[PDB]
Coordinates of C-alpha atoms and ligand atoms in Angstrom, one line a residue:
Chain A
X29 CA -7.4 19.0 4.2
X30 CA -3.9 18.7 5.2
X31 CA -3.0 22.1 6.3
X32 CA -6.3 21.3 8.0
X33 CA -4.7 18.9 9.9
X34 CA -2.2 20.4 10.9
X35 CA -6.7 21.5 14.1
X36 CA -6.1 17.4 14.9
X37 CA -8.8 16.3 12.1
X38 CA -7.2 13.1 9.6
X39 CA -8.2 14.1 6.9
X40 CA -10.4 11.5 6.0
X41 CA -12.3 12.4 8.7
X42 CA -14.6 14.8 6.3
X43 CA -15.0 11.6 3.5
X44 CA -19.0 11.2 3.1
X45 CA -20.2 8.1 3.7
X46 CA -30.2 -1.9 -5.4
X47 CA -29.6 -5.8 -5.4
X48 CA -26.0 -6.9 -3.7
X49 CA -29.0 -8.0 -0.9
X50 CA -29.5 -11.4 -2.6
X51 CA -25.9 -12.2 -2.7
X52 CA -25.8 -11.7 0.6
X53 CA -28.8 -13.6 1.5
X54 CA -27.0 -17.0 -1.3
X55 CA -23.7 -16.5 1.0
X56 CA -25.6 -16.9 4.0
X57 CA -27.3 -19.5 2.8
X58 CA -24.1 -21.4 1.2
X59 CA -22.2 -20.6 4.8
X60 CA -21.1 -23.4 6.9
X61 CA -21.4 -23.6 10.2
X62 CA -18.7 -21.8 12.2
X63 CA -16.1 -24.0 13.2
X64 CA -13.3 -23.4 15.6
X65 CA -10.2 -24.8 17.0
X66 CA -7.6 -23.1 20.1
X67 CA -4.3 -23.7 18.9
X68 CA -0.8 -22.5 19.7
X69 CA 0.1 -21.2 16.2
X70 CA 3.9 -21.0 16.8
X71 CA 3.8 -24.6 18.2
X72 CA 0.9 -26.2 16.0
X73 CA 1.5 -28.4 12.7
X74 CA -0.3 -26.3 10.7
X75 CA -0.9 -29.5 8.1
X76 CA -3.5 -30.8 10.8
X77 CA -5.5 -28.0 9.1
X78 CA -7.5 -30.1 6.1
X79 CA -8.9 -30.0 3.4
X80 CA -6.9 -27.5 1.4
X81 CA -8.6 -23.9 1.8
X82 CA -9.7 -21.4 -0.7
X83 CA -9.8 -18.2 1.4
X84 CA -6.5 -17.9 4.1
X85 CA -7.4 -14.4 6.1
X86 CA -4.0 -14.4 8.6
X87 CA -4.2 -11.3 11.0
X88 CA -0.7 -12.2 13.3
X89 CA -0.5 -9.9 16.3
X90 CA 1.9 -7.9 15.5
X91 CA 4.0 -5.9 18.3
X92 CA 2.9 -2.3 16.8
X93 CA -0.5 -3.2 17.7
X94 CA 0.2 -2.8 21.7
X95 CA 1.4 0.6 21.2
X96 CA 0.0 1.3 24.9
X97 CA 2.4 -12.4 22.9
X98 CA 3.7 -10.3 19.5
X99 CA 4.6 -12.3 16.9
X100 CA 7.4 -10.8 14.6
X101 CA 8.1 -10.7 10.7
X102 CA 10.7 -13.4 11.3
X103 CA 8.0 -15.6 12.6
X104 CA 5.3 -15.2 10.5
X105 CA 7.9 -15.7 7.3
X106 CA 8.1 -19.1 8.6
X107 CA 4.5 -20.3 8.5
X108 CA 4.1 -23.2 6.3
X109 CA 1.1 -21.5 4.6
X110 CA 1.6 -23.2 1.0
X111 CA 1.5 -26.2 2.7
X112 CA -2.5 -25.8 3.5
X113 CA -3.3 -23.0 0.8
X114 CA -5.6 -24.5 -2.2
X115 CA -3.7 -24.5 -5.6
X116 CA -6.1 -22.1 -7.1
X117 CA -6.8 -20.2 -3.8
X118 CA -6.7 -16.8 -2.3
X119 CA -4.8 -15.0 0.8
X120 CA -5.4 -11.7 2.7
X121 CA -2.7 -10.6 5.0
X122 CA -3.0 -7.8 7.7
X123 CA 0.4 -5.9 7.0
X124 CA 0.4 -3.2 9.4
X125 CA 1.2 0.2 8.4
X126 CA 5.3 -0.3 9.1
X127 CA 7.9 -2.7 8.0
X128 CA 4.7 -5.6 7.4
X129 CA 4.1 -3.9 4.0
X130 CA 7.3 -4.7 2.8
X131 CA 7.9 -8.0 4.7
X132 CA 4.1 -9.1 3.8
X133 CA 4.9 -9.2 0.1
X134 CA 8.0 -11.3 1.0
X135 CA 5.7 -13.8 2.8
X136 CA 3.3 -13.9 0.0
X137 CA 6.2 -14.5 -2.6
X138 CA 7.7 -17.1 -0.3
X139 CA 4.1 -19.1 0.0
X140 CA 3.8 -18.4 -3.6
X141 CA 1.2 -15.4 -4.4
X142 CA 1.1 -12.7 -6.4
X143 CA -0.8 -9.9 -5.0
X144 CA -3.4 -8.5 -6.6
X145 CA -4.7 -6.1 -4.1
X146 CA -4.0 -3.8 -1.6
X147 CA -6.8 -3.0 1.1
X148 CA -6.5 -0.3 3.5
X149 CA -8.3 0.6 6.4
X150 CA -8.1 4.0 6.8
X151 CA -8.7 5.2 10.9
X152 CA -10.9 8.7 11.8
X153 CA -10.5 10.3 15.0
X154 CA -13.5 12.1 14.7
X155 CA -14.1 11.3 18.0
X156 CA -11.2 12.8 19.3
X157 CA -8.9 15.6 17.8
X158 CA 4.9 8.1 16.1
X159 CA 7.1 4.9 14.9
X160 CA 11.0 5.9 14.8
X161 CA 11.1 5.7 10.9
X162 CA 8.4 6.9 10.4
X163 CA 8.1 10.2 8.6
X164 CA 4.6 11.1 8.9
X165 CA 1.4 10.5 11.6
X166 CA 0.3 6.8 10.8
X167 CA -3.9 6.3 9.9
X168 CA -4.1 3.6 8.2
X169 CA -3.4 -0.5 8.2
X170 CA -3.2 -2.2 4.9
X171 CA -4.4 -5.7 3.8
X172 CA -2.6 -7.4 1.4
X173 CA -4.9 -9.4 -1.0
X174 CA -2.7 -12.8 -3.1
X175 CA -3.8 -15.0 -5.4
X176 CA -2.2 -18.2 -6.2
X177 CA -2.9 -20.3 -9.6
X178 CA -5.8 -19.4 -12.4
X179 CA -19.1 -4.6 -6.1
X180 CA -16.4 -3.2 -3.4
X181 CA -13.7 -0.9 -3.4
X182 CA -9.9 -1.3 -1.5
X183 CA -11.0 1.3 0.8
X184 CA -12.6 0.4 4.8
X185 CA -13.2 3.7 6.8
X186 CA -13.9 3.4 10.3
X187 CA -13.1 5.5 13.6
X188 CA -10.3 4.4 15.3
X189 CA -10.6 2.0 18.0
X190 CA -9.8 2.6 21.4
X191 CA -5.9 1.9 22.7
X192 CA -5.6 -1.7 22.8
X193 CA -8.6 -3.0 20.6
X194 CA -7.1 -4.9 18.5
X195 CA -10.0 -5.7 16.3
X196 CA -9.2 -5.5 12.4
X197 CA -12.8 -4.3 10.7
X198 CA -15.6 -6.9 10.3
X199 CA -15.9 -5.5 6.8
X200 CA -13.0 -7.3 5.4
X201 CA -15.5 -10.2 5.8
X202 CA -17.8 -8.8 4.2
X203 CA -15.6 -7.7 1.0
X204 CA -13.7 -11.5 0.9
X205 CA -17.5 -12.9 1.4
X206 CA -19.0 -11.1 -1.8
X207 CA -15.5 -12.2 -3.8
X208 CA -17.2 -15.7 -3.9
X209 CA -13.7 -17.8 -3.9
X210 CA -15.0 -20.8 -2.5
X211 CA -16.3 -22.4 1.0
X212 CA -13.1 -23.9 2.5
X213 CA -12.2 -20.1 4.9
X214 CA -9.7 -20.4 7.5
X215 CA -8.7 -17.1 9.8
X216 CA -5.8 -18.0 11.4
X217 CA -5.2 -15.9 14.8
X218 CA -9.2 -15.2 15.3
X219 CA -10.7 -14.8 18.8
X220 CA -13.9 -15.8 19.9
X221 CA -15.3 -12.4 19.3
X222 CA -14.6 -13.2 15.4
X223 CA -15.9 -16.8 14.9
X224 CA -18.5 -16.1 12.2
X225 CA -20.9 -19.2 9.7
X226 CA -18.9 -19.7 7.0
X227 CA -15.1 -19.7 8.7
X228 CA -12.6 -22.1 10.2
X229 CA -11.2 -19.6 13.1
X230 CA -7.4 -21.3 14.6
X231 CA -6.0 -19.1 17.2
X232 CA -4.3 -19.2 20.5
X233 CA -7.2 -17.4 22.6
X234 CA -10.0 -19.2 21.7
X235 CA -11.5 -20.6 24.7
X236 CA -13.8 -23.7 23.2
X237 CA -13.2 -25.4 19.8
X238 CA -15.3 -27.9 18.3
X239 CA -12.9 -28.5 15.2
X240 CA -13.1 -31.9 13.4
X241 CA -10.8 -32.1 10.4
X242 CA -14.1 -34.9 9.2
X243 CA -16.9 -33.5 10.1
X244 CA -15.3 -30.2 8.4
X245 CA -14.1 -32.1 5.6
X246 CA -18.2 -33.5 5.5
X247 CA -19.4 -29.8 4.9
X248 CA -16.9 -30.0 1.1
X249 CA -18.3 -33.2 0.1
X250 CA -20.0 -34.1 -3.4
X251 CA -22.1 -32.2 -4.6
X252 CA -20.8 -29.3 -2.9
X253 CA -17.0 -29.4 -3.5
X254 CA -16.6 -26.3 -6.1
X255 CA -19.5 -24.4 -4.7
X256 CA -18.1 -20.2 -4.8
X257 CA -20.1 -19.7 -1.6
X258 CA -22.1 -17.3 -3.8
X259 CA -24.8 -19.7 -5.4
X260 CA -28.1 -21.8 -4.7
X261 CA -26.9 -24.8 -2.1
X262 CA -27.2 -28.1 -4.2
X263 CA -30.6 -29.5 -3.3
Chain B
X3 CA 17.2 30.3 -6.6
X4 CA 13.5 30.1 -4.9
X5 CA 11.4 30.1 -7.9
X6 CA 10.5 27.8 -10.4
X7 CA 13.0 26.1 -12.6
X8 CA 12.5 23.1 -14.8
X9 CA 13.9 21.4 -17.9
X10 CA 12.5 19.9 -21.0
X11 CA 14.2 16.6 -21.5
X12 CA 14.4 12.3 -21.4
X13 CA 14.6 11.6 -18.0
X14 CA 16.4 8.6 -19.3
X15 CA 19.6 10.7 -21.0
X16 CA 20.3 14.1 -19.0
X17 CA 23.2 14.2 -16.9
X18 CA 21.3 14.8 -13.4
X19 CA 24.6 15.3 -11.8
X20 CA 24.8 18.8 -12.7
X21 CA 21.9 19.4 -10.8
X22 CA 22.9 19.0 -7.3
X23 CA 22.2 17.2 -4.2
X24 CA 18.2 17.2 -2.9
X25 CA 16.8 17.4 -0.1
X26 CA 13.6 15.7 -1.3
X27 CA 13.0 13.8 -4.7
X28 CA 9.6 13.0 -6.0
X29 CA 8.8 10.5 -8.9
X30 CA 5.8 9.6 -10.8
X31 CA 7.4 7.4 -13.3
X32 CA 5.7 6.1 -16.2
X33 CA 5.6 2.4 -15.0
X34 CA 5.3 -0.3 -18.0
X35 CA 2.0 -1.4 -15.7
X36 CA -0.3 -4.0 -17.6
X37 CA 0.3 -3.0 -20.9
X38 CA -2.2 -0.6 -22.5
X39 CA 0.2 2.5 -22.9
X40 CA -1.4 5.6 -23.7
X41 CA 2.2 7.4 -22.8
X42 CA 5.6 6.4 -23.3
X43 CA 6.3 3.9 -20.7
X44 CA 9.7 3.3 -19.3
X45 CA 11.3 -0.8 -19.3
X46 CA 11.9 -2.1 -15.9
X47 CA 15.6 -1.5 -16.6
X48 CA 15.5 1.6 -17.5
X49 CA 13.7 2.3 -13.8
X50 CA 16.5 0.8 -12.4
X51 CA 19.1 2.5 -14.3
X52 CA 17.4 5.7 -13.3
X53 CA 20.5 7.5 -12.0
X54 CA 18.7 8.6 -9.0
X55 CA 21.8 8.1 -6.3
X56 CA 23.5 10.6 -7.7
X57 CA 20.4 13.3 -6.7
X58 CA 20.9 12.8 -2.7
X59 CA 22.9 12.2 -0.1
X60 CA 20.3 12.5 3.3
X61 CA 17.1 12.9 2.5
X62 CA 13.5 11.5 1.1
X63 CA 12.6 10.3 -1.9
X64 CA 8.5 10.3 -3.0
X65 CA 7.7 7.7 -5.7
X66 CA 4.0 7.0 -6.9
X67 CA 3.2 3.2 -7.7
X68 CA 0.9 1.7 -9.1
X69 CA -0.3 -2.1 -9.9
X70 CA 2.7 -3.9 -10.3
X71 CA 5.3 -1.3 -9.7
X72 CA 4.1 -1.3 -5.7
X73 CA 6.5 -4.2 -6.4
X74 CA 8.9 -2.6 -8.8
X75 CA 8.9 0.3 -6.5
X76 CA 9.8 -0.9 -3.8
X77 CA 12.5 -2.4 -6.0
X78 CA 13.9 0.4 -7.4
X79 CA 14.0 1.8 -3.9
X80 CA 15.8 -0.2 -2.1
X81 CA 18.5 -0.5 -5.7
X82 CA 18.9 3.1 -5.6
X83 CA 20.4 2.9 -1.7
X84 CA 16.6 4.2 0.3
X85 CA 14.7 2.5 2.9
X86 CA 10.8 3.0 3.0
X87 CA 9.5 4.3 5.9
X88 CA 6.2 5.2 5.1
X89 CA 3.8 5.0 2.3
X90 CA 1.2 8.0 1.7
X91 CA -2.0 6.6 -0.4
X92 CA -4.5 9.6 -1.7
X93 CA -8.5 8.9 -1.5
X94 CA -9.5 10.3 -4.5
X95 CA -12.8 12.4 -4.1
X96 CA -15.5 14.7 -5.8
X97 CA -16.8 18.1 -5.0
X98 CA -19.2 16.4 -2.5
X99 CA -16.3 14.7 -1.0
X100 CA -17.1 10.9 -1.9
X101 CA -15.2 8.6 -3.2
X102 CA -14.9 8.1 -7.1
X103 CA -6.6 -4.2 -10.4
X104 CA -9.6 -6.6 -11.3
X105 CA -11.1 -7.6 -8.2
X106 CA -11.5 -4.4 -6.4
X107 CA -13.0 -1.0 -7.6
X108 CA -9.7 1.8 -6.7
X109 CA -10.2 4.2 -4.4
X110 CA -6.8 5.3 -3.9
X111 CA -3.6 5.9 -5.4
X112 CA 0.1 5.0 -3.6
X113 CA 3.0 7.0 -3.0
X114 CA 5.9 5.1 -1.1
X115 CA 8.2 7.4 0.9
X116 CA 12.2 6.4 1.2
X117 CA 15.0 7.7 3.2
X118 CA 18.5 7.4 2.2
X119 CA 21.4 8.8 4.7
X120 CA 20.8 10.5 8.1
X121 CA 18.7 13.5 6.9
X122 CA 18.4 16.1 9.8
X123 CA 16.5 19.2 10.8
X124 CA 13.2 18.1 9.0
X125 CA 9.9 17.8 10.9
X126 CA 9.0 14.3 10.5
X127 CA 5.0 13.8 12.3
X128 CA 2.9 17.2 11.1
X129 CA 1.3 15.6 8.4
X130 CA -0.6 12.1 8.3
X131 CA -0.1 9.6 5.8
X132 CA -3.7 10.3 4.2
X133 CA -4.4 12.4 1.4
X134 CA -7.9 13.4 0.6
X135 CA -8.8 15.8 -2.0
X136 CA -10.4 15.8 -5.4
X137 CA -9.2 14.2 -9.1
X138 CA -8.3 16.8 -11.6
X139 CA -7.2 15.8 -15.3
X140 CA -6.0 12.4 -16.4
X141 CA -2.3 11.1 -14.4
X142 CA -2.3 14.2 -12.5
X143 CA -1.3 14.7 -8.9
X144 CA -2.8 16.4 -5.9
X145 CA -1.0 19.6 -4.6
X146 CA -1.6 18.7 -0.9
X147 CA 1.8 16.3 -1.6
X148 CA 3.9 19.6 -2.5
X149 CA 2.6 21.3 0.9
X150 CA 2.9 18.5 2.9
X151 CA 6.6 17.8 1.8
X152 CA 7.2 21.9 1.9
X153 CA 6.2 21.3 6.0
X154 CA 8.0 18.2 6.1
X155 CA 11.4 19.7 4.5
X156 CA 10.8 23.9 4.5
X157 CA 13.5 26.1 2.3
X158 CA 15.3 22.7 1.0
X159 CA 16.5 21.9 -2.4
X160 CA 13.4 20.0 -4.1
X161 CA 13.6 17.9 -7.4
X162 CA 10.8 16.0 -9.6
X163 CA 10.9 13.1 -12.0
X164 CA 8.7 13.2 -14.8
X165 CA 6.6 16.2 -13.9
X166 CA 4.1 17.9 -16.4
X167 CA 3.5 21.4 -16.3
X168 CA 1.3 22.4 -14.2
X169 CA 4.1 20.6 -11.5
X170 CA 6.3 23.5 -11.8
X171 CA 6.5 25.0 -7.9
X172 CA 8.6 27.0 -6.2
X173 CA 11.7 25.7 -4.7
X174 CA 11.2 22.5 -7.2
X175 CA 13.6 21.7 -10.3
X176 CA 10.9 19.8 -12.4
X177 CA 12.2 17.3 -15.1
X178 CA 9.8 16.2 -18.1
X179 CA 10.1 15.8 -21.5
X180 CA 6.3 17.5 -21.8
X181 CA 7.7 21.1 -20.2
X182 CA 8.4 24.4 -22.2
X183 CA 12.0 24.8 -22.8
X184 CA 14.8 25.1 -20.2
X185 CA 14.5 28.0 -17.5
X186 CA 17.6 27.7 -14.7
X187 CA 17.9 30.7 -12.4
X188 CA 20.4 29.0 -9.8
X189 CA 23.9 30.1 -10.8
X190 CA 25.0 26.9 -9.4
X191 CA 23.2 24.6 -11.9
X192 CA 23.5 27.4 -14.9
X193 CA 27.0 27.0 -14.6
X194 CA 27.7 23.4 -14.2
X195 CA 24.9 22.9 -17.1
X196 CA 26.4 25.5 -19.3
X197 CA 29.6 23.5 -18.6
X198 CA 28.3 20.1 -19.8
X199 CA 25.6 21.2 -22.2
X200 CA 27.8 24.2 -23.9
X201 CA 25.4 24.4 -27.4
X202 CA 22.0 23.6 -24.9
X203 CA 21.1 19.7 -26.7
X204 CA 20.9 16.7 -24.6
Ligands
LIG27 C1 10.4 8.8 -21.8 N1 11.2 9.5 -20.7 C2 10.6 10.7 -20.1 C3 9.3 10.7 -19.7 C4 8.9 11.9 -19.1 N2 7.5 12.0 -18.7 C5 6.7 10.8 -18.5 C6 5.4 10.8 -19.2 C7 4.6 12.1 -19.0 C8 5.5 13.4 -19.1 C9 6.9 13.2 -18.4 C10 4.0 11.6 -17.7 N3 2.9 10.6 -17.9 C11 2.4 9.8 -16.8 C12 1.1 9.3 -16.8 C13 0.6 8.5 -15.7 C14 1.5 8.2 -14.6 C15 0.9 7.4 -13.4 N4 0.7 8.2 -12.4 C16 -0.3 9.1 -12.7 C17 -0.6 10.2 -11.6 C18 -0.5 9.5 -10.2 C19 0.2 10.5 -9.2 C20 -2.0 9.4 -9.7 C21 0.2 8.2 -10.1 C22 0.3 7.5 -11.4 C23 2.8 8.7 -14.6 C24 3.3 9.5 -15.7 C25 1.8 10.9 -18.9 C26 2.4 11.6 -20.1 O1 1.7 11.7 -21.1 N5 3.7 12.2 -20.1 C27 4.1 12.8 -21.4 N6 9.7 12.9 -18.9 C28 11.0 12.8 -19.3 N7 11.5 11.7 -19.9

């Protein structure tokens, strides 16, 4: 399919597309309601941010995304993330498909995760038929999945969007959602068009917030503090 | 010499520096990943020690990772004097072209790409950095990677790390210590071999 390729088809444009219902239907039921908050990231004590979250889904803007304001590497490396991150807790990074997957696993060692996975959403053009270093047309973006302390594959194909949509896949939700890691989710650099039940979404775009470190906090409370987002809410 | 050349040997042991410069150098190294070991895997230190500088002076270098060694990798990499710019992942398939690490089923496997030097006259953009094709045996390799480099790099000097047989391509030295023998065809390399190796044991 290569060769191939080289009539304008990516290759994995020809890739062909029983319970796992009910878990579903126990996250939905488990999920908080969405809560949101506009803030200026680069200017913004991240510490405000409490309690202490489980899931940490960061999707920066980086500059390659405008191909047609960018954060860099330099800034993101200094985001205080261990500073809100549970200490048993989980991080998935949008890396980009250029220098990010290099200096992504820098950030996660420097907010102290290992990584355990690596995600990538590879981009059809079905629909329609480069960097400087780079060697090769670029198709993909990659995710970077840490853990820190003690169903679905790494794999999200979907057409390319168009120039300027900056949207990352709604199924990265859907694959941290059925990892059941706990309640307390924060995506850091959402948009209002990605505020979802179950999420904390902190961002610079927002245009309403309703974010109350207590009545967030309320949501964590006893009996509900170690609940994986995955079981029957404590009646 | 345009056809197929390779040599039985320890990777870890063989004097690569009668061999040549490369344009291109591919790896799949047998990373000490996990533990398991159904192969003889290689220490960290012994990757690093890898005398892979002396193979190039401008050109790419193609090294499959996997689990922790996306890490090591990228280690090894930048110790042996390459930047990576790019990182090719293959979607492994079946026949009906659908797809066939403890948190996530794998769908893929990862092969970073590093430049060293200022390589020139190669056509960097024809191929994407997808590959998509279907799993033959055990730890083996799709032969879309050999086409796509032979389009990224045509006519040049190519050399492989730890290749198995069936690896053996045309314009490609393949190393293994799992190959038949030693066949060298390029005067070049039968001379400075014959020089170092005079009674052929490594
Ligand atoms: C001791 N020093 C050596 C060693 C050596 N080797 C190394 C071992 C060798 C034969 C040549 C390769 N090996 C292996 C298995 C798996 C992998 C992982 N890879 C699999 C395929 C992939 C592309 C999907 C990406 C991941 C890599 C290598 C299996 C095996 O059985 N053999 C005998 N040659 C010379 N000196």
């Amino acid at each position: 399919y290569c060769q191939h390729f080289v009539t304008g088809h990516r290759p994995q444009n020809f890739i062909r597309d029983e319970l796992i219902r009910l878990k579903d239907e126990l996250i939905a039921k488990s999920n908080t309601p969405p809560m949101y908050l506009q803030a200026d990231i680069e200017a913004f004590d991240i510490r405000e941010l409490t309690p202490k979250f489980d899931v940490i889904l960061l999707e920066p803007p980086l500059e390659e995304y405008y191909r047609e304001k960018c954060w860099t590497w330099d800034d993101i490396m200094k985001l205080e993330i261990d500073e809100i991150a549970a200490p048993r807790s989980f991080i998935f990074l949008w890396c980009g498909s250029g220098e990010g997957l290099d200096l992504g696993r820098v950030c996660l060692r420097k907010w102290g995760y290992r990584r355990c996975e690596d995600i990538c959403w590879i981009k059809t053009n079905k629909n329609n038929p480069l960097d400087p270093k780079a060697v090769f047309q670029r198709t993909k973006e990659h995710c970077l999945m840490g853990i820190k302390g003690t169903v679905d594959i790494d794999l999200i194909i979907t057409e390319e969007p168009e120039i300027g949509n900056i949207e990352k896949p709604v199924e990265i939700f859907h694959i941290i959602e059925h990892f059941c890691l706990g309640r307390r989710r924060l995506h850091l650099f959402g948009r209002d068009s990605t505020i979802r039940p179950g999420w904390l979404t902190v961002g610079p775009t927002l245009t309403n917030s309703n974010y109350n470190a207590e009545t967030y906090a309320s949501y964590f409370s006893a009996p509900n503090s170690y609940l994986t987002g995955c079981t029957e809410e404590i009646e | 010499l345009f056809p197929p050349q390779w040599i039985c040997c320890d990777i870890r042991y063989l004097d690569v520096s009668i061999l040549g410069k490369f344009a291109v150098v591919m790896a799949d190294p047998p990373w000490d990943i996990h533990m398991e070991l159904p192969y003889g895997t290689l220490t960290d230190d012994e990757m690093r020690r890898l005398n892979i500088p002396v193979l190039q002076d401008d050109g790419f270098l193609f090294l499959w990772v996997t689990g922790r060694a996306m890490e090591l990798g990228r280690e090894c990499l930048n110790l042996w004097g390459y930047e990576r710019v790019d990182e090719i992942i293959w979607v492994k398939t079946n026949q009906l072209q659908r797809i066939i690490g403890h948190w996530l089923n794998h769908g893929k496997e990862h092969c970073l790409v590093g430049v060293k030097g200022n390589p020139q006259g190669f056509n960097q953009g024809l191929d994407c950095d997808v590959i998509v094709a279907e799993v033959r045996s055990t730890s083996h390799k799709p032969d879309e990677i050999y086409g796509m480099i032979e389009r990224l790099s045509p006519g040049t000097r190519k050399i492989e790390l730890f290749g198995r047989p069936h690896n053996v391509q045309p314009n490609w030295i393949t190393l293994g210590n799992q190959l038949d023998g030693i066949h060298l065809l390029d005067p070049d390399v039968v001379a400075r071999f014959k020089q170092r190796y005079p009674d052929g044991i490594i």
